[PDB]
Amino acid sequence: VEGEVQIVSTATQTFLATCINGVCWTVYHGAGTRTIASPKGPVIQMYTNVDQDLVGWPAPQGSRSLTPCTCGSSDLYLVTRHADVIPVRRRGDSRGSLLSPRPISYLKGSSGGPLLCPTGHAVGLFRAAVCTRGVAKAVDFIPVENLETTMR
């Protein structure tokens, strides 16, 4: 069995990565310019984009890639590091509102995870939690078009 989403970690931070189009993407604010561990040694990022908070390495072993969305649906579904799914309604190119706000912790450690459309296709990578008094009501993300362009 292969996973499209991998739970990654650094010496100080744990978050997620998502394989899309053969690349293992994640958020620069978590990975930095780090190499990804491999049973043959460190593997370097294929892409590093500080501006977009995006970095990607070749997809690791035990993974399978996700297909980008092509239906332009605005009904998104965020998957957390605990496998929970959170319905998010898109509000724009890179922002969505949780249908049911949740404690910030509920979303902690999940940046880098996928924002899926009704078909399970990648809409974007969860970038950051937009919260008020500790309650995450919205989500910030990196649309797949960015990943796609970055791969060029």
Binding site: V5, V8, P60, L116
Partner: peptide
Amino acid sequence: GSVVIVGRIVLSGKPA
């Protein structure tokens, strides 16, 4: 340092 994979998630819920 380096980023290490400590786990994985299968979207379809596929069991081994």
